[PDB]
Every structure is written in C-alpha cells, then in structure tokens.
Nucleic acid binder design. Sequence first.
RNA 1: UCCGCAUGAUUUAUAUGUAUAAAAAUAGAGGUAGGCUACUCUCCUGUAUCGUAGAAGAUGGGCGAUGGUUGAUGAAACGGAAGUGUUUUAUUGACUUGUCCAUGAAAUUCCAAUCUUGUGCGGAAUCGAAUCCAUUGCAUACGACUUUA
RNA 2: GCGAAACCACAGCCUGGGGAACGGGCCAGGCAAAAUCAGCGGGGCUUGUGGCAGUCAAGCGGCGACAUUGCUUUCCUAUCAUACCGAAGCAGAAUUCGGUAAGCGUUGGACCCACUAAUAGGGACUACUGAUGAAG
RNA 3: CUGCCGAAGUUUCCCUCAGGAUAGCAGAAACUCAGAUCAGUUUUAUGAGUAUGUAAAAUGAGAGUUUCUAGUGGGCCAUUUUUGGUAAGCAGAACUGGCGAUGCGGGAUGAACCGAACGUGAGGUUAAGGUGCCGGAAUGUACGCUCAUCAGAAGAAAAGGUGUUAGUUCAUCUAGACAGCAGGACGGUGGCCAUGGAAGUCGGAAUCCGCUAAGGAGUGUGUAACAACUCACCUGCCGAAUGAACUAGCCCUGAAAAUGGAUGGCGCUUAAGCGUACUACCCAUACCUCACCGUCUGGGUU
RNA 4: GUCAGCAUCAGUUUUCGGGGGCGGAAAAAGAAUAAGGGAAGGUGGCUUUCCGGGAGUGUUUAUAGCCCUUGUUGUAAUACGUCCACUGGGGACUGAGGACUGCGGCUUCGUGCCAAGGAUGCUGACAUAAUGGU
Lengths: 215, 168, 183, 30, 125, 196
Amino acid sequence: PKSRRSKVLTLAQTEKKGHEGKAALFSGVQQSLDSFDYMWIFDVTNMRNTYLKRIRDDWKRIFMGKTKVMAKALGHTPEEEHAENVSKLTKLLHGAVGLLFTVIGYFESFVQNDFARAGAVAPFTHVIPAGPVYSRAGQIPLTHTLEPQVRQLGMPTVLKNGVVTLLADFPLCTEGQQLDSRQTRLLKLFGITAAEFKVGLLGYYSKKGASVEFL
Amino acid sequence: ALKEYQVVGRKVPTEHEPVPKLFRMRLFAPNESVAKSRYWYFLKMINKVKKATGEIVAINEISEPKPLKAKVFGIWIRYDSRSGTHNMYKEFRDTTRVGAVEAMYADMAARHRARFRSIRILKVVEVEKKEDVRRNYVKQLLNPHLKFPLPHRRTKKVFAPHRPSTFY
Amino acid sequence: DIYKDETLTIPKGVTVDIKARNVTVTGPRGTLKQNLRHVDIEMKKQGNTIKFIVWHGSRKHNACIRSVYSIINNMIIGVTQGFRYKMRLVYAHFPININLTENGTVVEIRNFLGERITRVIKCLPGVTVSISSAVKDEIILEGNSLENVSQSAANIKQICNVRNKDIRKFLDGIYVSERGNIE
Amino acid sequence: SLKKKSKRRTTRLRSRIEKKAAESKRKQKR
Amino acid sequence: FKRYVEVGRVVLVTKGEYTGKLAVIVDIVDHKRALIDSPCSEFPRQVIRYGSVVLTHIVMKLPRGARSGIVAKKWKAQDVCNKWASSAWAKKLEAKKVRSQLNDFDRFAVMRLKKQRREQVNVAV
Amino acid sequence: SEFQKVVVIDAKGHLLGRLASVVAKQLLGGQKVVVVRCEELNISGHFFRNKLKYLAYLRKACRYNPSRGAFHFRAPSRIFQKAVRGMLPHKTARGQAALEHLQAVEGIPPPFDKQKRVVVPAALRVLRLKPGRKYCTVGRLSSEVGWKYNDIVAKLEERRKVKSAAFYQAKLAKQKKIASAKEASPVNQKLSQFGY
RNA sequence: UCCGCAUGAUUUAUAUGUAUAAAAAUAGAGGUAGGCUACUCUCCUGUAUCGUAGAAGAUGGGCGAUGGUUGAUGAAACGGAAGUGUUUUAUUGACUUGUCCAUGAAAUUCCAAUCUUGUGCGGAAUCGAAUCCAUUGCAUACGACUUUA
RNA sequence: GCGAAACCACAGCCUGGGGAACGGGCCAGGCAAAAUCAGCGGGGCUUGUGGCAGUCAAGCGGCGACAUUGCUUUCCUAUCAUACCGAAGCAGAAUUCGGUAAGCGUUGGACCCACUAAUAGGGACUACUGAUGAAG
RNA sequence: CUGCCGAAGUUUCCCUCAGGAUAGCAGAAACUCAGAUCAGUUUUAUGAGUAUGUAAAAUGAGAGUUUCUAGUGGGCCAUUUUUGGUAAGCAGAACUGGCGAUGCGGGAUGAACCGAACGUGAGGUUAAGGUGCCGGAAUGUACGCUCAUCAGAAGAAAAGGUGUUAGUUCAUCUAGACAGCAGGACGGUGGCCAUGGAAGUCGGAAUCCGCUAAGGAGUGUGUAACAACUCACCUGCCGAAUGAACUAGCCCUGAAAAUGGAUGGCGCUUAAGCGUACUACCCAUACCUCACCGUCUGGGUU
RNA sequence: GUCAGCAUCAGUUUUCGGGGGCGGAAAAAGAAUAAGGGAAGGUGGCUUUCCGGGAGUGUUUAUAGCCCUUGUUGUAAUACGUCCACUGGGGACUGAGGACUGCGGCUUCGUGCCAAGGAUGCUGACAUAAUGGU
C-alpha cells in the first residue's frame, strides 16, 4: 500500500528510557560534581569494557554518559554551572570524560595494551605467510581447525581438504597505514594488541581551589 | 461562484420565549436562498430548532476585507463518509476566503469524491504566524526565494506550418 | 514538492559536456559517452558543481534523480580511477582452461566439468580480460565503465553454471572475488 | 475487447442487476 | 532556463481583457496563481493565473508584496519600459499592432513602397 | 482555417488517434490530405501494452476460410489508414469518397518531399502527453509484428535528409544575401511607420 | 499520326494567386566573426514571407537601372522511393510603373486564360497480334493448361 | 432430341448486441466486383479445503475474523509426455513437488495386459473444395 | 373515405354454469339552482389518542340528476408497506402508479429507463441527453485523482499490494532525530537439571546480580563442543527531520474456460477516463408567435 | 407573367453596443496623504564567515520595504445586483385581413398628419427563361 523500508522487530524488552535516561545521566553528573574529590575528567577510550571494569574496580565512579550532555546539564555559562570558570572547562569538556572517586600515578603509568581500533596506524608491518593459516603469526608449537573462519574471511583464502589456505601472501597491515574496518576485523582474529589506553588529568575542579588547569 | 454570508436567525417570539436569542453563523452559499436553507439545516441539526418555528432576522453578504493580501487559511470540516462520520483539516493559500472554500470543495470532490451535501464546514481561520503553518506543501511555498519554471506551459487554425517552440 | 535537488562535485575529470541529455565525460583515463534521454530531469553545470534538479516531480519521477547522480559518479570514477574485477576460478577435478584473444576482449573456456563444449564469450565494449600470475587461476577484468565490466563479470559467471547437479556438492564454477579499482 | 470477457453487460445483466440490488436493499430493511 | 517565476519578473499578459499589456509579478500566491501589477493606469492590481501570462526575459529587483506606488517607482527608476521595447520581440509585437490598424489606402501605400523596395535586386556579380 | 487543394502533413510526433480524428474531419470537409512519414507516429501507453493491443488484432480472423477474415495490415501507413477509416462512415458513398481523398505513405516520396509539410497542434505529442509518460512509435511497433521495410525506409530517409539539408543551406545562403540587400534599401524605414 | 486552321464548341470537387521542401529537441535549438571552441545575438507559431497598382489588364512619351518580367526557344547539368521535376543556361520576340505624364472606357445608366474530345482540314509518313478450325499429352469430367502449325 | 413436379411473403456473407426467440432484415462492426462448371451436402451460475461445542479477541455494537481444544475437424489449459525452470538429504542414476508452456504427440488387444516418451482432462439459397471467366 | 366522442379490466352483488350483472367509463333524451352546488386539494377550528373525523377558510369549476344502452370484467412492470422464511434466492397479501388504445426526443440497439402526450406548415427556444470522429454541438475554461504485460468510461467482496495521493491518532528530534558508519556490545558464569558432545542460540523453570552510557542466564546464523559474526543496548563522527498504527480517493489481485468481438465502433492516457465548478453551444411532434384545416362553444344577423 | 434588389413599416425574434439612475460594510479594495502599532518569508545595514560575490548572523527602515489601526483626500472610483414608459446598430422568418368606423398620439382647430383595429413604396431583369409541376 506504500513503498517504505520494512522495520525489523525483536523481543529484547530492553528499550532505553530515552528522555528519562538522559535525565538520569544529568542527575548522575550533578552527583558526580557533588562528589568528594579527585575531580577527574576521563571516562573511556578505544579499549573494551574490560579496561573500564578494571578501572572502575580501582575506585570507591567513572561515568560520562552522552558526551556534552553532562556539560549541557551543568551549563557552559558560569551562571548555570555550579563550578567556577566552567565556560572554558566546557570547551575542554568533550568526548569520553567523567568524574571519579577512589589516581594520577596509576593513570600516568598503568596503560594496558588492547586490540587496535579502526583509523589508527599499525604498530608494525604484519604479514600473513601463505599456506595454512597462522592465528598468532606462527606462535603455536594457531591450529588449522578454523573451518568456519574460511567462509567468514572473504580474503584470498580457499579450503583445501578442510584446511584454510591463503593462495597468495596477504599483508594484514603495514605501519603508517590507516587501520581500515576490514583490516581491524582481520587483525581481531589475531593477537595484535596495537593500542594503549590513556587518560586525561589536565585539571581538577576542586571544591575550594576551583582550578581546573589545561595541562 | 460561492459567496460568504452571515445569517442571523431565531425562533418566533411567544409566551414561552418572549425574546429568543439571536443565532448567527457564517456559511458559504452560491446565492441567498441556499444560505437560508443551509442555515435552517444547521440550526435544526445542532440546536434542535424547527424551521417552521423560526425566521431569519438578518442576512448579509461579506466581501473579503483585503482581497489583494496573500493569506493562508486553515479549514476544519466534518466530512460525511461511507460511515457518515469523519473529520478533516486542510490548509490553503489564496487571497479570498471564498476562494479557499471553493478550492476546498473541488479538493473534496477530487480526493474523496464528495458532494456539496456531505461537507459541513466547521471553521475557516486566517493563520498569520509562519511556524503555525502545518502542511508541507504550503510551508515550502512560504520560503523567501520562491522561483520555479512555468509548470505545465502547454503552449482554431488547424495545420500550423512550423513545429511549436513549446519552450522558451 | 516543487524542487528536489541533488549536488555533485566534479573532480579533475576534464570534459563533462551534457548536450541533449548526452554526457561525454572524458578524464585522464579515457572517454565515455552516455545517454540520459530516458529520464526527464534538469542538469545544470555551475563551475565545479553539477546540479540535478526536478521541478514538480512525483516520487516515481523523483527516484530517478539519485540514480542519475550515481551513474554519473560511476563514469567519473571510471575516467579517473577505473574499475577492476577479480574472478577466481574453482575447479575440483577438471581444470578450467581459459584462452584470451583480441587483447583480452574475448574469452574461451574449455574442460569445464569435463564438458567439451567451447564456452566462448565476447566481453562488453571497454572490458579487457587478463590472467593474473600473483594468484593462480583467477582473472582480472579491467575497464572504464562499471556497467560493462560488471555485466561482463556476470556473463562469464552465468556461462559456467553447474547443471542438474547439486549446488551443495558440485560447487564448481567461476565466481567474482573482489570488486575494486585500478588505483 | 482486449480482455478475457465483455465489458458491455448484456441487457439481462442490465435487467437483473438493479432488481437484485433492490432485493439487497429490502434485505437490509428487514 | 531563461524564464523563472520570480517575485519581480515582468510578464506579458496573453489572455483576458488586458491582453498585450505588461505587468510585473509582485507576489506568488500558489503554484497556479500569482499577483501582478503595472504602473500603467488602466491596468489594476489583481491575481492572475499562469495560463494567462507569458514570462519575459526582464527581472527587476522589487521587495515582496510592494504596494502600487513603490512598484511604479521601481519600474520607472529601473527603466522597465524602453527596456522591454528595446528587444526585437517587443518591436515585432508593435509592428503587428500598427499593421493591424492600416486601412485600405494605407495598404496601397504599403503596396507601392515595398514594390519600390523589391525592384532594387542589386547583387554583386 | 484556409483550404488548399492538397495538404501534406509530416506525421512525426503526432498521436495516432489525435491526428486521425482531425484528418477524418478534414476529409469529410472535402479536402485532399497526404500524410507523410507515418512510421514515426506515436501512440500513448508503453510499447508492450500496445504490442498486445495489436497482437489481439491478429487474433480476429473468420474460422471458415480465413481468406474471408479480417486483413491485419502491418505497414504504419496502413495502421494509420485503419484509424481514419474507422472514424469515417465508410459503409456509404460519402464515407467511401473520404478515404479516396486520403493518402498515407511511410517516409516522404519524391512527389511530395519538395512541398511544405504542416503539422497539427491538436495532435502533437509534446503538447498533449505529460512528460515522463510512456509511449511507443508506430514504426517500431510495425517492425515487430510483420512489417519488413523499416530499415530501407530509414535508409532512404537518411539520404533524403542529406539532400534536403543541402537545399536548405543553398536557400539560406541566398536568403541571407537578399536580407542584406533588403535592409540595405533606404525605403525600408520610410515605410517602417506602417509596421513592415 | 501531326501540321494545321479549325469548326462547333466540348470543359473542369480547376478556380480565381492551383503561391512557400531544412533537421531535431521541447528540463531546448539556431545564427556571428577570430583562433576544439570562450564570447555576442536570435525563438515566445503564418495576422508571416513572396507576388499583388492597368480598355481582365489598351495605345504613346519622357526620366532613371542592366534590371524585373513573360511567350516561344537551341542547348548543358542533376533528380529512381511513386524519378510527376529541379537547375544551368545562353537566345529570340515581347512585356516593359522603378518614377512622372497624355489619350480611351460610359445608355452593360441601382445586384443578377487551360481542358480536351470534337469533327473534319490538305499536307507529311506509318504496314501488328489473338482465338476458333487442326495438332501435341508433360495436362484433362467439360473449360483450362503444355506444345506444333 | 424430348422434357416434368414439389416448393415459392421477400430475400440469401460473417462476429457481437438487441429483456424473449435472439433473427435473415434492427444496431455496431468485419467487409463487399459480373457470369458461371463440377464435387461435399455442412447449414456474472460454476471449482481447494465438513458439521457440533467451548476458548480467545482485531474490533464493532452481544457478536466477533483467522487460530485453539474437544469425536466421527477445430478450440480450452485446469500439462500425461517432450522443452526450460526453482526447490527437496538432490552424491550419481532414478524420482518427488512447483512454475512458464497447448508448438507438438496422447497406442494396440479381451477394470484389465502389454507396448510406448506418454497413453492428460474437457467444450463445440449461402457456405466449403477445386475449375473457367468478361473488364477497365 | 374523412371527421367527432371514446372506456374496461377491477368494481356491485348474484349465482348450477359460463357468465351476467352492477358500477365505472363512454354516452343519449328531460328537468331543477346562478348556487357553498361541487372537488383523487390545501388550510383553520373542533373532540378522541404529523395523522383521525366533523364543521368552516383557501382554491378551481356552473354545478345536479332520475330515466336506457353499447364495450370491458384480464394481466405485466416497478414503488411502498410484509409475515413465514435460508447458503442462497422465495413465498404472502394490501396499496400505488405506468402499460394495454401511444406515436416523438434520448439512453449504440430494446414491452416498461430518462424527457415528452401527436391536426398541416414557418420561425424561435428548450427538456432529457450530449459537444474528439463516426454525429448536429467547446480537441472549451478552472481545480484535482488515476499508469493498469490486456486501465476505465448488486456476485464472488472478505481480505492482500515495498503502487500513489491526502488526511486522523500517537512517537523521538542541534541534551544531535531516522539512517548510515567506526567502537563497545562486559565481567560472576560453561548459573541449574539435562549429555557422547550443549559454553545464551538440541533441550525444562527461573533467568539473578558489580561497572554503568550498555551489554537480554541471550536476537539469529554457526560450531561435535568451542570460538566468531549480527542484533537489543549504548558511545564516537554525522547534521534535521523522521518513525508507528489507522481512515479515505484511484489503481493492481480477490478463478473462468473451450470457432474471432466489442465502453456501439475507431480510438483516447496532463483524456476523448474519474470528480467538481463555470460558461458557450446542439435539438423533440415539447414550449412560444403567426398562417391554414376541422370540430366544439360563444356573440351578432329582416 | 416569372424572379430578384432596396427602402420605410407591422408581428415574432436573435445578437452586440452606449448612457443614466438606484442598492450593499451607502460594495469591499485601492491611490494619495497624516498619526500610532507590529514585525517579518530580515532589506539597508549588521557583525562573523567563507569564493566584488556567496553564505549566514542576530536585529526593526536606515542606502528596500511589509503588515495592523485611525484620520484624511472622500461624500473617491470600481465590481456586482437591480431599474430606465433612455438609446445606437447587425440578422432571420412572417405580410394573414381587404372601402368606412374604433382605441390613441400628433395635430389644428375645419382640417388633417401619423409607426394608431394585419405591407406598402421605388427599381431592374427575364418571355423559345425563370419559377411551378410530373
């Protein structure tokens, strides 16, 4: 009766609160601004939830929600914001940044490696030798039992007698090249931890000092 | 063509109602008699006042106060559908309230194959705030830099000698 | 709706003459002459941009404006980057024998599934077929027009279809592997 | 024609269509 | 194109009792009607359709919905007349109008001069 | 509006029935009509639709001795003549005489390619059918249901256009010369007050 | 069969000026000069363009241009889709408004050229076939058909 | 060469429609060129899906839709074969179901018994066939 | 031969039968009152429970009779009621008109549909229905809908359509809407019975928790089991409208065969289809003016 | 006799045109010209952007203007409706009746004249034709 895109439906029963969720995030941001101390601005990075879970463990609460939504709730103008000189803070307040309560040394030093994300530059020039596939670049003393991965690769790989075989040498990634989605997904099947989680501690919105530096 | 009439009517004075209240409504009819007939039908259906018991006290044709100012009208109507009950609201842009009603009537006879019988016009309103305009086609008309090629140019002396330019 | 618009930025593709619905798009790689008479739309060339304009168009008419944009973009890609199609032969028992004639515009196919019918195809104009050495028994189709290269890739694939057998087991034939560009 | 049938209803159909419409209206009245 | 339904374009009326007159579009009522006006006294400001006009090549700046006085002042200032007549299109129309008014004696005057004009037939050998 | 002895209509871009209706009226009006270039006539509706409209015409044939049955002419001129004939009272002597005043030919033969070809704006496709509406040419529609002279007529049309263009270039060269001499005469603007 | 006068006329879905050949698109085409062209200009139907002034088109003169223009020609070129013709022509004889003059029309005193036979003209040159009868048998109810004569 | 009679309102092409009986006359079409010779006698139904009871319940104004539970010669295509096609645990072969498809076949002997690729289901004077023939 | 008047089908009963009656109608002859003397009509008042009747204002007409005497005493069609009813039609009465005796215009054509009730003509104007051509009359004006591989000019019918256009009621949206992309889509935990192997995804109940901005004891594919991918859930970039349920108009489908065929034909597709409004035009035996024929009636006429 | 043309008339009619009243919110508009109000689909500018331009940007007539109310020109015109026992043309059909009255108006004070109780006047052509028959 009308040409329109058919919408897929499922039964998750986990629909987000939408406006209520945004209000809850704003309330949490206000409480985090009302927290005791340590005035951190750092929430997430390219790392998975495991790094976030480990970071949350070493604290007695890192959370940002929708970026620039907490800043909007606080208000860019100093009149709306409860803090001082937040007009310049809001400009710096962007991306995955959130308050915490547990620090500086751990964030500066402890940087665990993790699988790379798209857009970055490869730390090296990974090359996949031809023949049987090597999951960990020939570190197995990486079996050839990857029966379903052969159909799921798409790259120059054919199944020979139940063994995945790359007919031609396929360079997985090269240093200085932007990490494509296909390159990142292909590297996911391998042990390429070409990333390092970082943090941002430029300033601290202390209750008394109110000096959030731009370092 | 249609013309807009204000008709003021009331029932006959009597001991029960020595001074019956005046009832005035604006309604669109091609002529005087249709306006009175539509008035009696409307008052009977709405308020339950009989034609015999009443009489018209004033009928006046109303001209357009500004027949040269481009205006946008919103029309609420109660369409008598196959079920006899349906409501509508359509937007129009022209210079005369009668023009909007006339264009609405042709629009009804086209997109719903309606009659003069089945249409009951609730209210015709002048809308002046741009952001209060709802319909998409009229809103896109309101943009300041309107310009478009002459749509459907289409242009006895049979047997013309040269092929028509049919263009600029 | 009075005006549906679609905008196209023209790269260093040299000549984009648009006389009478006909576009002679010429780039560094070559020249493609295409006709757009089938659609009735406005095409305006303002310096570094091309404006696709539909006045008082229905949705049936309006849907053509994106298609016209897409095909013009495709031919622009062709005269700038070109189109490359890699097809990998699959043979289980009988090798598939391929012969190339007329700089690779005609393909001869032999010994497919043991058949002795000579499956011969003439590539659509502007399509060159070559056998690559870096990867064994796979074919590279090079050309300027995506439509002709893609259809030629389709023609070769549908020529060598397995018949009366199972797709489940007899999964032999020629399949398109990669769909990229020259650079 | 161009069709699989004839669009001109023969006068029998012009005859019994209206009466069977009349019987339909009588049925709703009942 | 060359003819756009613009607020401020002057159009040539081709139907109605004002056939041949020159007016300027002041407003766009809708897809099929536009409001037009002319400084010429005989022609009143009114709403005309698009089958009853033809678009000309002259576009003159004029603010939306200007009154009759402002439109006339802008028309006089930008010299719309004597710009329309400068075109060979207007000259062809005026030639047609005056040729319609010729009487029998003037037709014989036309007779004689163009026969004098014809007999020149001087071409280089 | 004014009659000639004979009218030669160039039938390129005219609709089949729209042109045949005007021609039907002019024939009974008492005027000889020659329709040329019939193989570019247009019919509303997409090609496959009209191909079915004509393949149903092929189905009508008397079951006894089909030589008695209806004769399904394939040439574009004959299809146009069928349209006009059905729009005439051909079962009389005045309807019969109207057909005899009608000539329908595919292409423009030498007897007529040296005369002016007028068109009928009441039947022109560009003034009747909305843009984007599917239509089919009679010349294509005949070359797919039996008519076997499409290519030769197209071949002869190409040669005729070449000869006709060469004539026009010569006529323009002469016409621009006299126009230069036309404006050169001074009496031009001593008659300009009469609009000529 | 025409020369040829006719001679009587027969005549016109004649005909009243039997006036006019680009091609293509209509969300476009065309024209100008200069070196694929930047740029200028044209369109908006033929109410146009060409011819058109005279005892149904008379008889003269002057002025002005080498023209227009026709009847008849003695020839060249081109046109095959149905070539129904186009053009080049030189020629002759006209006609000769481009412009200005003189003669004549009238009591027709309020409206009502082309077309061919025709029939013959007194002068030219022209000298075929088919069937029946007969035959054949490749054909055949009879016609017809295939042969011969 | 001799030479009837029956019969005769008038006539004789076809498709559809004309309340019926739709016809040879009417209407709308297809069309339509003298004179004859010899054969042949021709003349808006309907379908592929049962009945009782309860439960929902889109909803409307108590019903309530599907679902659930209880028991008992020519023509048509709606294609058998041949052509192609899509699916199936379709390995090959063989086969099943379905789609396009009426070009082309659908047999021989007393429900049977074989052949076969298969032996699928159905509707129903003029014309016809040859032969002369006058004429622009 | 022409002219004039002109019914009836059902009544009034009666019958053994067909019938008559009897009316009615059409008439034929005689005689009242210039009247409330009537009416296939309305109105007012009046009682009883808009209609009812009686009585009286409107309205048109000259209104009564007693007497004798021809022809008819069917049926069909449709409306309104109307009880029994069923797949479904069907039956039953009462009433109404029309038709029989009726031609004419229109609907292609037609016993009943739409107009119109007929002497011979002229002119003018219309009804119904029409104005592309056949065909007399606008290839008119204006606003919309519709594209159909067999569009269009109450029976299947209820339903279906990623056809189109309008509306109705709900949703998010520059705290970045929809989509598109990159990334996360977790850790107790391979929760518990169930088993060769079941790790959320062969299978039975919950189906809980820490981080939250989010990770469902899990949406599917899949693996022997794994693993992996996708969603459902969030975030980064991206910049503005977008999604859901309904109703309607048009179109498509909603089975129907057996020589070739019909909106009447040809054809038509910004109609020559569908709907509306507006003008102009076309013509009947109809209406109007005049002439003529006839009948009837009225006035005058030594 | 036959048939044509015009004129002035009468009857019926059809079709354009002009002028003048009168009516409505005493049309509504509008124009011109004084107040006040409002703003935009935001102009000058406006600042910021970007390729003299584009784009915005937020504003209140400035280097465009618009809308609303009131006054005024005004008591404007126009439009429509309606009426004129006001008026100018074009066209078609008909010409029944056959002294005399009458009804009128002009007259012209006797008389008459007249478009007033139904067509006459002027002219031409044709006669072996033209009409009218079969």
